Amino acid sequence: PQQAPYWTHPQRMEKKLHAVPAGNTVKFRCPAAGNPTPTIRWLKDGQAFHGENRIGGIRLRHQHWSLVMESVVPSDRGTYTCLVENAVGSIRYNYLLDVLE
Amino acid sequence: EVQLLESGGGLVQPGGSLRLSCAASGFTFSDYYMSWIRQAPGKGLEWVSTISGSGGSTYYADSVKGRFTISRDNSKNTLYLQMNSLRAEDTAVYYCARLTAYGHVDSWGQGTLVTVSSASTKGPSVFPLAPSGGTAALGCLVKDYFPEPVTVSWNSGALTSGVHTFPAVLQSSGLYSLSSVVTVPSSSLGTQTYICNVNHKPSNTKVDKRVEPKS
Amino acid sequence: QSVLTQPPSASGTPGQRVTISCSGSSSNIGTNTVNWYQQLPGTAPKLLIYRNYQRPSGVPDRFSGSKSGTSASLAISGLRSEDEADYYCAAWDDSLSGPHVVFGGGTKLTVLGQPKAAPSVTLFPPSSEELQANKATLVCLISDFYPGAVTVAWKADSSPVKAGVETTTPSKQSNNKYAASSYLSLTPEQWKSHRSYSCQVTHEGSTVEKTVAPT
Numbered sequence: 001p002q003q004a005p006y007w008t009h010p011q012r013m014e015k016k017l018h019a020v021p022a023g024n025t026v027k028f029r030c031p032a033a034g035n036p037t038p039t040i041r042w043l044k045d046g047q048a049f050h051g052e053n054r055i056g057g058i059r060l061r062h063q064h065w066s067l068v069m070e071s072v073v074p075s076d077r078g079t080y081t082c083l084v085e086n087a088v089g090s091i092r093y094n095y096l097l098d099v100l101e
Numbered sequence: 102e103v104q105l106l107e108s109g110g111g112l113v114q115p116g117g118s119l120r121l122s123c124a125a126s127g128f129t130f131s132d133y134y135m136s137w138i139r140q141a142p143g144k145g146l147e148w149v150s151t152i153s154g155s156g157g158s159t160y161y162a163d164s165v166k167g168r169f170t171i172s173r174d175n176s177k178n179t180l181y182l183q184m185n186s187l188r189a190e191d192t193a194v195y196y197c198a199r200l201t202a203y204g205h206v207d208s209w210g211q212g213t214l215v216t217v218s219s220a221s222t223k224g225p226s227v228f229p230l231a232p233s234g235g236t237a238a239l240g241c242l243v244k245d246y247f248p249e250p251v252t253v254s255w256n257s258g259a260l261t262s263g264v265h266t267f268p269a270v271l272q273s274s275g276l277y278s279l280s281s282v283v284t285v286p287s288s289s290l291g292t293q294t295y296i297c298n299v300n301h302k303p304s305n306t307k308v309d310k311r312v313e314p315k316s
Numbered sequence: 317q318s319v320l321t322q323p324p325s326a327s328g329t330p331g332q333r334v335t336i337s338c339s340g341s342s343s344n345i346g347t348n349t350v351n352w353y354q355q356l357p358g359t360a361p362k363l364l365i366y367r368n369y370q371r372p373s374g375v376p377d378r379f380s381g382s383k384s385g386t387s388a389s390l391a392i393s394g395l396r397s398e399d400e401a402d403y404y405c406a407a408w409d410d411s412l413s414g415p416h417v418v419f420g421g422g423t424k425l426t427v428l429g430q431p432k433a434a435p436s437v438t439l440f441p442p443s444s445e446e447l448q449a450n451k452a453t454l455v456c457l458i459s460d461f462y463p464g465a466v467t468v469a470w471k472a473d474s475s476p477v478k479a480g481v482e483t484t485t486p487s488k489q490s491n492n493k494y495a496a497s498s499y500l501s502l503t504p505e506q507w508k509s510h511r512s513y514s515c516q517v518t519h520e521g522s523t524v525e526k527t528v529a530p531t
Contacts, residue, residue, distance in 0.1 A: 014367055017201070019134070079415060093347055096158065100154060163413065207363065209360035228443040228453075238376055242453065265495070267484070268495070279497060
């Protein structure tokens with residue numbers, strides 16, 4: 001019996017809307033578990049997101065299941081989706097990001 | 102004190118446009134996500150649209166996508182809902198809402214009613230309902246108006262006791278009628294002037310009508 | 317209609333425990349926080365429960381929110397009369413379209429065992445003013461009745477009249493009892509030509525009748 005992916009720290013995900021002062025770090029987390037161990041990837045505005053096009057790139061951590069962006073700027077505004085998948089199943093969550101002048 | 106003040110609702114033809122506004126104070130407006138939520142009368146809540154503090158992100162219900170636009174002017178502390186290609190099914194009270202970091206509403210406006218109909222504004226006719234021991238009743242008939250709402254008061258707000266204003270009937274014509282009555286002792290009669298004050302903001306009509314015993 | 321499912325109605329007698337349920341899916345309730353709102357007639361919703369189970373300041377321990385899987389529960393213990401209201405669950409929903417807010421269709425909670433009450437009825441004839449405008453409306457106002465179910469029947473002289481009557485749905489006055497009104501449209505000729513017209517209101521088997529005459 002393998003197990004579809006599930007969130008391991010739901011309580012940590014509750015702050016869905018993030019209104020961040022320009023210059024601060026935003027950290028988005030989607031801790032999951034499953035068998036086999038799920039993979040995580042991020043979308044921005046529905047598009048695969050690697051941070052090739054943002055100043056400073058991103059930190060990714062499969063270890064922490066997190067997306068980390070330092071020095072947020074206006075063009076960072078958007079919707080960030082974490083897709084957690086394994087052979088068995090699929091789960092997704094959205095964080096909303098705003099950046100304050 | 103948080104304050105959210107809607108304006109702009111009213112009557113519109115199918116296919117027409119309307120812009121709602123909502124003026125905010127008591128908080129840093131540009132920090133917050135703001136929403137529009139609507140309710141058709143006697144029906145459930147339905148989310149229309151959300152916008153982020155800066156205005157940089159925009160989210161819409163499927164049924165309004167490509168007809169409505171949410172925007173905000175932060176320097177005026179004002180939220181807007183531009184509504185285009187309006188359909189009958191868009192008739193509803195529209196509410197401004199403030200969102201928390203947790204995605205729920207923590208503050209609502211009073212709502213503005215939007216009516217989407219090919220029917221034109223009709224101001225009401227106002228008729229006296231004359232009375233006559235025994236309890237007496239006198240009142241005002243506010244007949245054939247559209248759309249809602251009507252306000253009735255008596256003696257300019259000085260009389261509230263014995264006053265019963267009944268909800269309106271919707272006639273098969275599509276026009277509304279309602280009644281307001283005062284209950285007084287028959288032997289009262291001739292001792293107190295009764296004037297009913299009828300406001301119909303949709304047609305910009307005010308009617309004052311003195312009501313007294315019939316001859 | 318709504319993407320969350322609630323039962324349309326719930327009832328309880330005072331001091332009972334009632335639970336309103338709210339069924340959803342993994343993309344909404346399963347993954348996102350549930351919120352509950354209470355709405356009183358003609359007013360904006362009020363927050364009862366946010367982040368699944370937390371109570372805002374001012375909301376008594378009698379209201380408690382829970383969820384399990386894709387289903388959430390608002391439990392009300394110590395049911396009070398003033399709990400009668402509409403209740404809505406709500407949550408964000410991470411769908412393929414992107415994030416959107418979804419509501420339950422609402423649950424009307426009724427608090428039972430309130431005392432039975434016969435209707436006050438008053439019937440008014442057409443005003444002289446209206447007859448001069450070449451119209452005639454008879455107004456039957458039914459008030460202070462419990463429970464909220466009523467039959468209204470009109471008679472011309474002694475024969476039933478079906479045409480030209482409009483009756484509202486009974487709704488609650490601020491005193492917790494029901495009010496309604498019924499309107500009969502006639503030609504001034506019809507009104508002047510019969511001996512009398514009558515409003516017959518039947519409530520729980522008892523019938524009160526009122527009568528007016530063109531004389």
